[PDB]
């Protein structure tokens, strides 16, 4: 068999990463890359079949959700792309008040948090 199939959601577990000879009937395990959270229904294992081809692979992990943005006083929050990992919210202000401008959901430690805090306006 060749190298196991690359998947955006997960990454090959150690030490399979440092391995280049896979006989038939060899099982490899994956793990969720940051932030990505493991999906309980799907199981992250692949087997080299007799045809020297790996078993069908599906995304075993899903993007983590950032907390709710909140409610900026005298301000409007624009959420064009949800609140998943990698989204960007926009902070605006009403007519008659002066105002950062945007915040990004990024991995900070073991979970995902917003970057810029809510401004004042």
């Amino acid at each position: 068999c060749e190298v196991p199939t690359r998947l955006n959601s997960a990454s090959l577990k150690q030490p399979y990463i440092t391995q280049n000879y896979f006989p038939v009937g060899t099982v490899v395990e994956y793990e969720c890359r940051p932030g990505y959270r493991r999906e309980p229904s799907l199981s992250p294992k692949l087997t080299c079949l007799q045809n020297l081809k790996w078993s069908t692979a599906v995304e075993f992990c899903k993007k983590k959700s950032c907390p709710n943005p909140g409610e900026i006083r005298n301000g409007q929050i624009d959420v064009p792309g949800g609140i998943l990992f990698g989204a960007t919210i926009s902070f605006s202000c009403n007519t008659g008040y002066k105002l950062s401008t945007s915040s990004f959901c990024l991995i900070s430690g073991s979970s995902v948090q917003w970057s810029d805090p809510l401004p004042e306006c």
């Binding site: 409007q76 605006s92 009403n94 007519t95 401008t101």
Partner: protein, 255 residues
């Protein structure tokens, strides 16, 4: 005998009288009615209050000055907080109604001017910044009137609506608007203008809080003028009566 310059309208417990009126414009020739069984889609039974909902509601007045560009009103939004109409459309998910609009202006024989009173269906508007879209507060004014602007709104990092009077905020031509059922108030001829509009939409019913079907635009084409000594405060009043209103999907009140 009769004249044709006098007209009375009676709806619910309200009446409107006029001594100097032009004719009455009736939508696209269609009178508002209810929804038929061969054209409905929702299955539960609708409610039809028919008395409290179908009555004349009188919004605030606006002063017409020698330099006023004009005003606009979103009818589903204008009556949202007024009377049972507001309570009905609040609890319900779907709504369907036709709007009759009466706009009245009072003056003397020594005052001059001209207003265009037009009902625009689906008056989608633009923003001062080409990127980004207009904010709800700028587009929708409730319990109040929104005003156009004589000069172009500046573009910056803003969500303000482009209010140019010559582009009517839609980028089109103000003169060509007549394609929509309209009327004029010529201060030498008629005190008031009345338009009856049926329910126009592409679906049978629609949520009255997230979509505004029609928009009323009062635009002075000839500026108000008078000689010193005569009255300087001339207001404009708008009365709206819902007609054949039915609602479906009773649910928890939406604020």
């Amino acid at each position: 005998g009769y004249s044709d310059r006098v007209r009375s309208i009676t709806l619910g417990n309200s009446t409107i009288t006029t001594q100097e009126c032009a004719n009455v414009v009736v939508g696209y020739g269609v009178w508002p009615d209810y929804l038929k069984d061969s054209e409905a889609t929702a299955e539960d039974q609708p409610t039809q209050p028919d008395v409290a909902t179908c009555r004349f509601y009188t919004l605030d007045s606006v002063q017409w000055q020698k330099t006023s560009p004009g005003w606009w009103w979103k009818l589903p939004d204008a009556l949202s907080n007024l009377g049972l109409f507001g309570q009905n459309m609040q609890y319900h998910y779907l709504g369907r109604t036709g709007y009759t609009i009466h706009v009245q202006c009072n003056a003397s024989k020594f005052h001059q001017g001209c207003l265009l009173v037009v009902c625009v269906p689906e008056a989608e508007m633009g923003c001062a910044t080409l990127d980004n879209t207009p904010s709800s507060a700028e587009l929708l004014g409730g319990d109040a009137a929104k005003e156009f602007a004589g000069e172009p709104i500046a573009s910056g990092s803003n969500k303000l609506v482009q209010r140019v009077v010559y582009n009517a905020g839609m980028g089109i031509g103000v003169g060509n608007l007549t394609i929509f059922p309209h009327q004029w108030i010529n201060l030498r001829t008629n005190n008031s203008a009345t338009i009856v509009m049926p329910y126009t939409n592409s679906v049978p019913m629609d949520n009255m809080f997230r979509h505004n079907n029609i928009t009323l635009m009062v635009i002075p084409f000839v500026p108000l003028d008078y000689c010193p000594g005569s009255t300087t405060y001339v207001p404009i009043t708008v009365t709206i009566a819902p007609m054949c209103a039915e609602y479906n999907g009773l649910r928890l009140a939406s604020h």
